[model samples]
Target: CPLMVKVLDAVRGSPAINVAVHVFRKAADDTWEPFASGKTSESGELHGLTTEEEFVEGIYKVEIDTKSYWKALGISPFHEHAEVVFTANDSGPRRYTIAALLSPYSYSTTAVVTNP
Candidate 1:
């Protein structure tokens, strides 16, 4: 897969299963267009978001729906969502892993890029 995601629940110290994720690609006119979307699996991982051919060199955004995740667990979260925006495939095609650690009031996001 060219793109993947991993989510962790900081409060529970476990995988954050079923969290909603959305992928967007920046358009030529400086607008974000929907690319792909999915939810994390039981292991808090998501795969096959896009193929290398389709995921061309461009600015991309990965949005994680953190508010609903916390609400489902009966907690109020400060942030509505967490987003990571970055340029991809600048030098060449690469694989990306977006990892997110989530808490009620705060969250962190990171990315790992490797040659595919």
Candidate 2:
């Protein structure tokens, strides 16, 4: 299974460039351990985000830090850091791609994308 993330601008409907994205797996001890981290490019993509983990089943966290992104533009977004918790049932054979729409005021993501 492969895991990647794409970020887009909610208002501009374009790529959300330079956004910092991180992936974390909940360890057996309930501690969050970073599995992958990267920034969105001109295409608003961070590929091979979880390629190393490769669908390992567990509680996964996707953290998007948008403070600097919004602040630098002279806008004060509500949340500097936004995180989404999801369950990865990739123990079988599956591939997942997560996508999100982001703006200075809000952000949103669909459930999940999986392939068999």
Candidate 3:
């Protein structure tokens, strides 16, 4: 399973970019429940976004829109769109960071979550 979201910077002379990572918790019966949401910082680092109350779960997943993230800036985009999946259980996977590095022309990203 994949764990930790990794944001790697790419291409130097490009345009500004920002990406958002969504997190959710899976219930005991295999249903998904929304948990927390966080965005990639300008420095391209992930942060602890789990709310103190509602993070417990049976499974967890993430979705990222690479194409939209760049297109929003009025710039041409590169690379296939990316979606990274992972699961979190009792004592779920921890110590992870989700990140994506982007440029005017390209992007490289890794989701640091436990993959199913």
Candidate 4:
């Protein structure tokens, strides 16, 4: 598993379970092509999003459905979605953890990269 994601719910002080996540890779024509999609687990973690062999050096986009996640709990969120776009594996293969902290009106995201 070269890529993983962890989402936390700030208001509830717990993992944002079952939140939707979509991953995309940038194509030669400067378009985002869907690569993978999944939902967070009970622990708010999504694993095995991509393999090292398939995750070559390129730009990637991670989109999280924050609005739907909040709406399902009867809360109104300010943002329609949360997204992070970055370049990966520029030098060599690495592991990435995309961590997100979510609130109704705001959210924060960070990435951790480690040698694979």
Candidate 5:
């Protein structure tokens, strides 16, 4: 089995909403690179980033557009946004999935990437 991650939320009415994911993994140079990426569906499900773990002892940072999701949900802009900060190590050979849930008045924003 594998980890199934999805980014979802109430779309309310708009169907052109957006969601995104960014990754950082170890490379041959013993450093991390900004890896895998995808967006959520209209039903709010961005499943299965192919490059979850690039190598052993790898590391990744997940981010979402909570501000945008909420904004599309018929909510007004907000001062705060939601963010999911987690780690994915090379544990075992499995299908790992990640999720990014959002709302218009909440996760309505651009997933600003900041990782070394």
Candidate 6:
């Protein structure tokens, strides 16, 4: 699946730009392994992220590194490293977008799958 992540500012209801996003593929041993990493663009969007060949249909997690972003903005980081776990299947070639609604205090993610 090609992944896209979008971060939003829950407080102001706007895009959260320049935030770091980390992707992890969960191992069968119940450990998380880092797979891909990137930062949000000016529009708070990260697109065209491809998983490794070993990435099969399973559970995966996305971490939004908000420590630096919140600290620098003078906001208390209640949810410093916000994480969201989601599932994906090899339902054939498709695009999956994970939208994260984030604030200085909390966050959540919604997995949206689209077939092109």
- For model 3, residues 48-74, the per-residue Cα lDDT tens digits are 766434444446776555555556656
Question: Estimated TM-score per prediction?
Answer: 0.91, 0.82, 0.57, 0.92, 0.53, 0.80
lDDT measured at residue 45 in model 6 versus the true structure, 0 to 100: 94
- Kindly list the per-residue Cα lDDT of model 6 for residues 1-116, writing each as its tens digit: 47889988888787887789898888889898887888888788997567535446777888888676677678876566678887766675556888888765566788888775
Instruction: Please name the candidate that would achieve the greatest TM-score relative to the true structure.
Output: 4
**2 or 4, greater by TM-score:** 4
Report RMSD (Å) for each prediction in the order shown. 1.4, 2.3, 5.6, 1.3, 7.7, 2.4
| Each model's total of backbone clashes | 0, 0, 13, 0, 24, 0
lDDT of 3 at 27: 66
Note the Cα lDDT for every prediction shown: 0.87, 0.77, 0.53, 0.88, 0.49, 0.77
Per-residue CA lDDT of candidate 4, range 3-92, in tens? Answer: 999999888999987789999999999999999999999899999788888899999999988665677788776666788999999989
Off by over 4 Å in 4: none
- Model 2 Cα lDDT, one tens digit per residue, 33-109: 98889888889888867553455788899988866666756777767777789888746546677888886656688
Please give the lDDT score at residue 12 for candidate 6: 78
Shift in Å, residue 43, candidate 2? 0.7
| Superior candidate under lDDT, 1 versus 6 | 1
| Best of the two (4, 6) by lDDT | 4
The total number of steric clashes, by the backbone 3 Å criterion, in model 3 comes to: 13
lDDT of 1 by residue, 18-57 (tens): 7899999999999999999998888999998888789999
Model 2 lowest lDDT segment of ten: 48-57
Q: Which stretches of model 1 miss by more than 4 angstroms? A: none
Worst 10 residues of 6 by lDDT: 47-56
